[PDB]
From TrEMBL, chain A:
One of its GO terms (cellular component) is outer membrane-bounded periplasmic space. Residues 210-308 form the Penicillin-binding protein OB-like domain. Residues 313-575 form the Penicillin-binding protein transpeptidase domain. It is a single-pass type II membrane protein. It catalyses: [GlcNAc-(1->4)-Mur2Ac(oyl-L-Ala-gamma-D-Glu-L-Lys-D-Ala-D-Ala)](n)-di-trans,octa-cis-undecaprenyl diphosphate + beta-D-GlcNAc-(1->4)-Mur2Ac(oyl-L-Ala-gamma-D-Glu-L-Lys-D-Ala-D-Ala)-di-trans,octa-cis-undecaprenyl diphosphate = [GlcNAc-(1->4)-Mur2Ac(oyl-L-Ala-gamma-D-Glu-L-Lys-D-Ala-D-Ala)](n+1)-di-trans,octa-cis-undecaprenyl diphosphate + di-trans,octa-cis-undecaprenyl diphosphate + H(+); Preferential cleavage: (Ac)2-L-Lys-D-Ala-|-D-Ala. Also transpeptidation of peptidyl-alanyl moieties that are N-acyl substituents of D-alanine. It is found in: Cell inner membrane. Residues 11-124 form the Glycosyl transferase family domain. Cell wall formation. Synthesis of cross-linked peptidoglycan from the lipid intermediates. The enzyme has a penicillin-insensitive transglycosylase N-terminal domain (formation of linear glycan strands) and a penicillin-sensitive transpeptidase C-terminal domain (cross-linking of the peptide subunits). In the N-terminal section; belongs to the glycosyltransferase 51 family. One of its GO terms (biological process) is response to antibiotic. Disulfide bonds join 489-492. The chain holds residues 52 to 757 of 851 of the full protein. This is Penicillin-binding protein 1A. Pathway: Glycan biosynthesis; Cell wall biogenesis; peptidoglycan biosynthesis.
Length: 595, 598
């Protein structure tokens, strides 16, 4: 009974196997397997009937490491075999594990394991259980691990892993052994859209930054893996306008000029070389490249896995339901989920929060704010363009992200009142400094926390908690957990007990939502959308946080090791296209839904 | 449901607790405990109130290290507390364990444990779960582990551990979690006798070789343990005829001259110094000594834990039932079991086996054998006393353990026939050389193997297998295992008949040679036979003996082979232990001898 993961549309997306026990009838056990146990220790005081008799009481229970309880579970976990498919050497390997299933474990100590195994094999021979022929064959046999994957997550990988890693982080490995059916809030259609939007958007950034050369040269093709619809290939012949490449299935393909002409060489983030004029400028024979076929598989193109990373998080602003989550370019690259674990600075993307606090004090979007030079101790917060617009409306100050106005508003609204608000918005106390730079978007945040914050605007001023579990059923069919979330608007559900806490005045949240809608309509065929771009120092991060009354989406683009994305790569350039693509498709065929 | 260890007499002597889970109703959990779990991680995506509802599904299952499954089992294992007796700091400590019950465990990483705990306490404060008063109190609170012992083995330690260690060696730690009742072959009365006989015998050897000085000097008293009716004490004041010592309970005691005057100093294995004339010659202030009190209490005496080791193994020669087992001086001094793990040379104790084969070939105890110098290619075996008795009867050659006669009999018998016999009674093929020195007792053996050997004489020529399990019951009362041993004599008690490894007449004649050896070369008994043994430079002292109902093998020696002394023999050293045990174990039982079946 594995841990089962479902989307909100009843689709089984992942299965997590825990502690495994496959009981077998004693008479079904190969005699050599019993012999391997009998030879595993020099002396039994319980040729020797008694140990065989007492072995039958433990044979399906013995902890053999790596979640294996009993001989059948070990045969499955280690070799993906039935006990009847095991070789003498593999039987001797398993029989050496009861004593210390870590010291003699073949996964952790392969040397120490073979030492123990060969000793048992030698003893099986001395005891007459095996012939010298069987013995020589078995000692020469390598470890031969064929460990099946028991963590099945090949449909919506980020969504599946979110469940396993969270249960394990909070409740440890026993959470998987439970055999529970976890019904998530994940919308499979929206999840599929998000995965494609992040892939396309990262590839769009990547391509405009240029060809970075083959990922490897003169390395074995078998050491590479396909992912994100990219297939490792080896360059075998280079011509003037085309090249030949060897695939992982042994077939040779040809890439025509049209499939590689895009390859202007990357020089740095703000520079690409001249458009290629010959295939020899792009590839060398023995290069390990990535290719992509078309739908028919009649044509192939030279592609590139982006070095840049990204994420997308989409929540329901009324209850905090996580509808879609993408934590990187592709889950094969690494299990790392940037939506939940990726601490980055939010930049201008934090301003709607602070400005909503100014609106709380009695200001209006039209209220005049002062964009002039300022000082705190010695520090001078300067504007992006080194310009000062003087007295301007609050809404224009926000749209143009004026840093002196922000610092001035922080002084008006007080640091602590803002820190408490950032905390109400979802933000971590420890990650929020007790200084004036917070008005700038200096606190490190998680994209999920930003989504929670933007939901306050979409919902009318309420604090919602992001959640991914709708219900949990036991293996026997009983509902053991039903989500009871805090709702911003209870009448809104029935287009439910817990009412969410109001963290912002209704009028301030509504005003900020409309400023955000005006911002998105001065920088999809929809009129119910609002949003804010963000970019950090030296374009180390590109953000877009936006919403409608039914859905909040936060997109991020950047390198894991903070490096410039490029002079031209503002939040509005790199993150915004991902947001648009997802939102346009996720909201296609839904009526206008404002605050 | 722990693993229960029982004696043949249906008496519980040990309990082994495995994986523990004490389920609790959610409403019975202190709110601060739930708060500690809520504060254990920065973000929950299941404030964060949803984690509370999901926590109820895991609260009795969460693996918290050291066999603890669930909050109540951790409160018990770590603090011997109920969840309602836990402090805020202890609740924060437990709540920090789910993530990594090894990287944050207070038993293994106390530094990492406190780091994680204090962080959780800090977060409980920031979340408003605890006041600053509750917080300052809790951070200042030390680890405060009060771990109850769940491996109860304080009655017959070597017997209890034999069961736990064997199940764990063959079937791993899951063997304990099974909740099975093991009804063993151990006789509690005989086991109690054996423990006392080994202790007394080792102490008798020890005392005559002199005072070796305190076991430690300027070391912490808390690092020592009481065992074998010896209590660690620290010398605090030394006078002319007496000394003051600090006990583990904090009380100061006085040892008078009478309690320490025995302390002639050990000079070497064959020498002791002058009798002490003042307490300063025996003890220094800050010395870690062992003391012993009266039957009630009035005075204390300076005692010494022997450096010498010993063992005793007693089996039933008809089925191989292990009736008594003592693996060393004290299980608390050394967990190691010399009866089952102590590979040593048997010396002259092997001779009855070789001489028995010579009887199979048609020789009689009276047959003349040649005790003269002999050369086996390169090797020249010499006799113990460097004497040669010439033509002597086979039985006298055995009694006086004549090495040249043994080598001559090995040539008559043949190495392989001998090796086959050694293997037949349990000796290990790898431990038996393919040379003439085997006649002298050079193969490395276990005392349990020697007991199995000597049972062939007591039973009339049969191979029995030593065994400690009579039956196993599950927690629900069902018999899941019943011993089906090989019996030497079935009418004597399915049923399994043991294999004959020696001729009835050979076993009978060797038994009577052994009887003569014990009756006329050393209890009010005439049904006993036995053999002494001593190895080169008295590195080992043995006594293997029996009656028709019981075989006992005793051994004395140092773990790192060193001489016992010139005088220290068979002897002398291992024989008094055997006598003491046998005399008492057989007290009130009729005469029991072997049976001839030509
Ligand atoms: C908003 O994201 C805003 N960015 C900034 O205030 C920050 N850097 O801006 C400069 C121009 C210095 C840059 O080098 O990009 C900033 C805030 S916190 C941090 N680490 N950097 C931009 C200007 N507004 S947007 O509308 O262009 O996104
Ligand atoms: C038998 O145990 C017999 N001992 C010997 O043959 C051995 N050593 O004897 C000497 C005298 C050297 C000794 O110091 O004890 C011997 C056998 S195997 C080995 N490594 N050494 C003794 C003397 N006879 S008994 O009657 O005491 O058993």
């Amino acid at each position: 009974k594995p841990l089962q993961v479902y989307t909100a549309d009843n689709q089984l997306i992942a299965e997590y196997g825990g502690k495994l026990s496959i009981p077998v009838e004693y008479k079904q056990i190969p005699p050599n397997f019993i012999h391997a146990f009998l030879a595993a220790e020099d002396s039994s005081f319980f040729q020797n009937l008694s140990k065989e008799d007492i072995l039958s009481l433990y044979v399906n229970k013995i902890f053999l490491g790596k979640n294996a309880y009993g001989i059948a579970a070990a045969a499955k976990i280690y070799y993906n075999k039935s006990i009847n498919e095991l070789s003498i050497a593999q039987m001797a390997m398993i029989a050496g594990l009861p004593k210390a299933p870590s010291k003699y474990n073949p996964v952790v100590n392969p040397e120490r394991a073979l030492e123990r195994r060969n000793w048992i094999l030698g003893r099986m021979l001395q005891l007459g259980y095996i012939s010298q022929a069987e013995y020589q064959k078995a000692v020469a046999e390598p470890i031969n691990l064929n460990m099946p994957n028991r963590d099945l997550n090949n449909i919506h990988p980020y969504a599946g892993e979110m469940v396993r890693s969270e249960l394990v982080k909070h409740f440890g490995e026993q959470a998987i052994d439970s055999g529970y059916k976890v019904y998530t809030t994940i919308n499979a259609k929206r999840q599929a859209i998000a995965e494609k939007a992040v892939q396309d958007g990262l590839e769009a950034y990547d391509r405009r930054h240029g060809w970075r050369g083959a990922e490897a040269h003169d390395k074995p093709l078998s050491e590479f893996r396909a992912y994100a619809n990219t297939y490792p290939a080896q360059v075998t012949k280079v011509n003037s306008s085309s090249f030949e490449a060897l695939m992982q299935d042994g077939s040779t393909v040809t890439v025509q000029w049209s499939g590689m002409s895009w390859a202007r060489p990357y020089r740095n983030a703000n520079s690409v070389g001249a458009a290629p004029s010959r295939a020899s400028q792009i590839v060398k024979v023995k290069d390990i490249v990535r290719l992509r076929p078309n739908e028919a598989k009649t044509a192939w193109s030279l592609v590139q896995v982006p070095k840049v990373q990204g994420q997308l998080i989409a929540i329901n602003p009324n209850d905090g339901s996580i509808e879609a989550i993408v934590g990187g370019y592709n889950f094969y690259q690494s299990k790392f989920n940037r939506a939940l674990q990726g601490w980055r600075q939010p930049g201008s993307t934090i301003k709607p929060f602070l400005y909503a606090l100014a609106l709380e004090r009695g200001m209006t979007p039209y209220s005049m704010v002062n964009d002039s030079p300022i000082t705190i101790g010695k520090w001078t917060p300067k504007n992006s363009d080194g310009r000062y617009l003087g007295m301007i409306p609050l809404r224009r100050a926000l749209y143009l992200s004026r840093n002196t106005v922000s610092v001035r508003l922080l002084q008006t609204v007080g640091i602590e009142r803002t820190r408490q608000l950032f905390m109400d918005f979802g933000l971590q106390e420890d990650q929020i400094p007790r200084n004036y730079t917070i008005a700038l978007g200096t606190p490190q945040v998680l994209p999920i926390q930003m989504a929670t914050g933007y939901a306050t605007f979409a919902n009318g001023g309420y604090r919602v908690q992001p959640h991914f579990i709708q219900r949990i059923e036991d293996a026997y069919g009983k509902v053991i957990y039903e989500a009871k979330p805090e709702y911003a608007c209870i009448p809104c559900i029935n287009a439910q007990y817990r009412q969410a806490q109001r963290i912002l005045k209704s009028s301030s949240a509504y005003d900020m939502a409309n400023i955000l809608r005006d911002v998105i309509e001065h920088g999809i065929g929809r009129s119910d959308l609002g949003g804010k771009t963000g970019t950090t120092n030296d374009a180390k991060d590109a953000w877009f946080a936006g919403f409608n009354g039914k859905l909040v989406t936060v997109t991020w683009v950047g390198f894991d090791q903070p490096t410039t994305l490029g002079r031209r790569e503002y939040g509005g350039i790199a993150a915004l296209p991902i947001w648009i693509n997802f939102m346009g498709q996720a909201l296609q065929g839904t009526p206008a839904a404002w605050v």
